[PDB]
């Protein structure tokens, strides 16, 4: 009858709480993947479940170890369960959700879930989101769409996905291109999939690397110091992101030191602090005279993760353009 | 029987070209004031306008000196006006605007114009912008309202006006409170004005500073580096405006090194990468505790220039939170 | 010492229920205000709360009469609570918004509030928008901003407020003019207030009405019928509202009706079924030659609550217009 | 080595004009399809343009006649070509789009296009809009997507596209499933296609049809008349469309007489006022019971166009239900 699900817990919100159900104020991750699980019942009626916890942290604290052990212990164990579903904090979820979306070879369902409000809140999310997420990880027409995220009973794909507000239980929007389908009644009508390359058609491979290359990011905005971009350059950092102003433009400071350090061998993607659009070529940077790439629709965060997994194969900016003209 | 409307000019696409109509390439600060003017003669038939070109940059370069030029030209030049239009960049025109909206103490109408196709580019948008921002400064129903943008039809206060899409001709949008008014056929219907205090109604004189607190910006992601945050502190920052993740969150690294800096006489305000919503006290982060500021609705862009204000005032957390929950 | 707020119940989803959590099935009717406070159990540390169910229906079925009993009833108890709280069906609560918005006297808070989701459901939205709703109607800060929506965490003014989704917790949005405030942890940051005029600056009294002048919704799209039109005609309708294509515009067929209609003394309204933006006069259709009224930004709906008000004191355009131009 | 396109104009403001740069008024269909290429020289260095009038209409007043005019034009010609676009007015050009995506058996481009501002009018959008349209045609990658609408920089698909805004230029989106991709410097990245069935994928076939079966729209609201729902069933209507209020609820009295129109032959599909979501089954209406279908994403305008196609095959419930969940 039923599917076997993998639940694989990380912490966040959606196993967080605190001292009374109208108060805002929360502590992230002291619930247990078994007792999220068993606070849903009804997750027995759609599929046979096993939880396992990864780690227990809030997803501000997310970073590269939990990234390698999520892909590795997917990727392992893609043949022994029919789906899996991540429980994870909102507000990095974005960043692990692509991360996954391109290295993840996995093409069962790969379905990733969180809460904006703590489980002992009043109207709580989380139970009728995860409930929500088994249901997109069972159905047999979620596979081959990449990862996914499932939030406000919308099936969203991991590269375009994002937080749109702090603190709403619909924030989760894919804000260039749209979401993949809606769940009603337990049902989802799919109308749309993914074109840019995920999963089983990247060259991305973790499955031996212990470290990812160090990339960071810096914000520009008036007066915009280069101090930060200094910093990440005289660290030795392999790559690194710019959240541009507009379409991607770099305060003077900034563009100055990003270009010492292209011509040195830094990878260099400029993106944009802009919510929707692609930071493009052909604007006001001529990004080939630098080295510079250009992140398309990627965002700062979402850029540092497809710089990161590109810096595991090349260091030439013209491949790393490529890589962000296909991924 | 019209009104007298200056046109401070710093640049911007508004002012920019291109060597081909279809072509996205363009260079910024290409035509000057007397020329943008001259480009659009039905600005005759509703002000008597006069140009002064103030600078003549993009606004990706735009810093603290061409802001107290501005206010202190405004100031200075109020009782010689009916009304004031600045052209400008679009990339950190939500900056510039919110600064003068804390900083200008004229209540004539001040409106801030750009484009997002260089003059050159076919159904180019700056004429009919240039056209409907002195339709508005000509509006006596325009004063009081605090420093506005008028982009794309729309009538938008300094202080929730922000660039929501890299490219679109419809990208300047008041994303939390909504707009103030919408013109149609050179006629406006205010329904809506800013509650939060502005020009005449704020403490913030800048008119003999010859330079601004060092407020810098730092971005949080899945393993965000403290080195740009520490690079800051170790200049010495009056100020850090941290673009959080979700709710305002910090990275562990950064949320340390910020929580120090603050313990040792940095200003730090928690706001949000997130591109709507407030950054609201009693989540996860016990502001009171580490002498943090919560920046409610305020971007990190903008979080930083009421920052810069605050600390002409101020280096005292809880009253940079009163003025916080006041500008 | 709490306030004393009242709850007047009217039915809706918020008390509706399915026979399962997790199915979609549900029935309105069936469920009494004390059931919708006894989930609430946090209302008795912000209010004394006292609940009265005046109709049981789904709002698909809201009319005239109920309408009148509210108008009535809240403005004969003004001076015996501190507020009101109205639950009500999603459907057409922004018509019963704007209705109250219009004829309600008392500018002591007056709150509406409901669900999308059945009171039965996994993570149902009811009980946390309805404590939010007596948050809001116990705020001092929300008197004398007309009648008000509170829906996922935000203060939405009754004249903009509209259902922008079928199915969405979030659904409710001020589309045009945005929201008013947003609630955190309990207390409201209002930053706006409704500039068009609302309860007692209205000459609507409805305090001795009986029942409302007809008005009629119909619909233009390719190819429109002109006997739904014809229909309204036929049965002596008072009012005709327009859903218009683009701004406003009509199919010639029922143009043509209308423009009859106008001469043997049927007021017609121009709104249009595009969910956002002003309905124009200046535009394709000559309002002052035909005798129609030109509805700005009021949608249909909302259109035909206004002229219904407008057809108690006139039946002259050029008056209805002016009352379509201040309301 | 250019593509041939060609240009079916069928009026519009595109082609429409006012006494003014800077008025709003202006007439619609004036201009001839040579006038509108002529304004236009760089469509010269994309495509080898001809155009053809079919009609030159206001699309307020677009009907059946123009459709099938439309459609067996373009099967016709399908093989002298390499693609198609075609001028109309913006308020029905949803419907136009989609009725040509079912029709249309040419799996070339074929793209729509409109303007929201008068060819006349300063930034006239017109232009730009209709270079962008001969881009996306002179794409091969356009081919087998549907029909298609290009506005705003955007290629929409023909199912999903509505309009949004009264005026915005920006007023076209795909507000359910989100655009298949955005165009900038004359490319486009195609990130999406529509996974509902069209063109060549639909049993419907136009090609010996002078007439469509009739189908008229009643709107719901509170205190809805029962007399346009009547109007169209005496008059032997094939089917109604009602425009619901929330997912797609009726008023009692609209409910009752569609209920006795559904027994006893007439096809009533529910779609929903509401401008985004679907109008699902499984909520307040059990549709079997009444042998009414469910209209899913589906816009009133939009469900008649697919209510028409599917009565020249069918008057079954459950098939037309069919054809409701595939096209
Ligand atoms: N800070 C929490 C927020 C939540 O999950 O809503 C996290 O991302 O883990
Ligand atoms: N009434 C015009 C509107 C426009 O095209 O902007 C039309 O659809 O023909």
Redesign the interface.
């Known amino acids: 009858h039923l599917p076997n699900i993998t639940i694989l817990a990380t912490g966040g919100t959606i196993a967080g709480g605190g001292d009374?159900?109208?108060?805002?104020?929360?502590?992230?991750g002291k619930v247990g993947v078994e007792n999220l699980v068993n606070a849903?019942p009804?997750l027995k009626?759609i599929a046979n479940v096993k939880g396992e916890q990864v780690v227990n942290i809030?997803?501000?604290?997310?970073?590269?170890n939990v990234?390698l052990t999520l892909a590795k212990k997917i990727n392992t164990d893609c043949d022994k369960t029919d789906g899996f579903v991540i429980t994870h904090?909102?507000?990095?979820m974005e960043?692990?959700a692509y991360?996954l979306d391109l290295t993840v070879k996995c093409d069962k369902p790969v379905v990733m879930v969180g809460a904006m409000?703590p489980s002992t809140?009043?109207?709580?999310?989380?139970?009728?989101?995860l409930?929500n997420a088994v249901v997109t990880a069972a159905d047999k027409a979620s596979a081959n769409r990449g990862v996914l995220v499932v939030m406000?009973?919308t099936v969203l794909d991991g590269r375009?996905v994002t937080?749109?507000?702090?603190?709403?239980?619909?924030?989760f929007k894919?804000v260039?291109?749209?979401?993949l389908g809606?769940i009603?009644?337990?049902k989802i009508?799919?109308?749309?999939?993914?074109?840019?390359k995920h999963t089983s058609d990247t060259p991305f491979d973790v499955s031996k690397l212990n470290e990812?290359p160090?990339v960071?990011?810096?914000?520009?905005?008036?007066?915009?110091?280069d101090?930060?971009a200094?910093?990440?350059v005289?660290?030795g950092?392999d790559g690194i992101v710019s959240?541009?102003?507009?379409?991607?433009?770099?305060?003077?400071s900034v563009f100055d030191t990003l270009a010492t350090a292209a011509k040195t061998g830094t990878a260099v993607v400029r993106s944009?602090?802009?919510?929707?659009?692609?930071?493009?070529?052909?604007?006001?940077v001529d990004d080939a005279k630098y080295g510079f790439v250009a992140s398309?629709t990627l965002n700062?965060?979402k850029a540092?993760v497809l710089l990161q997994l590109a810096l595991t194969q090349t260091k030439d900016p013209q491949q790393i353009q490529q890589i962000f003209n296909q991924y």
Request: glycine content about 10%.
């Open positions: 009374s159900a109208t108060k805002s104020n929360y502590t992230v849903v009804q009626d809030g997803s501000q604290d997310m970073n590269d990234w904090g909102t507000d990095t960043e692990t991360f409000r809140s009043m109207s709580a999310d989380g139970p009728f989101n409930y406000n009973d375009d937080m749109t507000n702090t603190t709403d239980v619909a924030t894919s260039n291109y749209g979401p809606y009603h009644n337990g009508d799919y109308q749309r999939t993914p074109a840019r990812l160090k960071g990011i810096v914000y520009n905005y008036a007066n915009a110091s101090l930060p200094k910093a990440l005289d660290a950092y959240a541009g102003v507009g379409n991607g433009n770099l305060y003077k944009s602090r802009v919510p929707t659009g692609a930071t493009t070529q052909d604007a006001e398309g700062p965060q540092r």
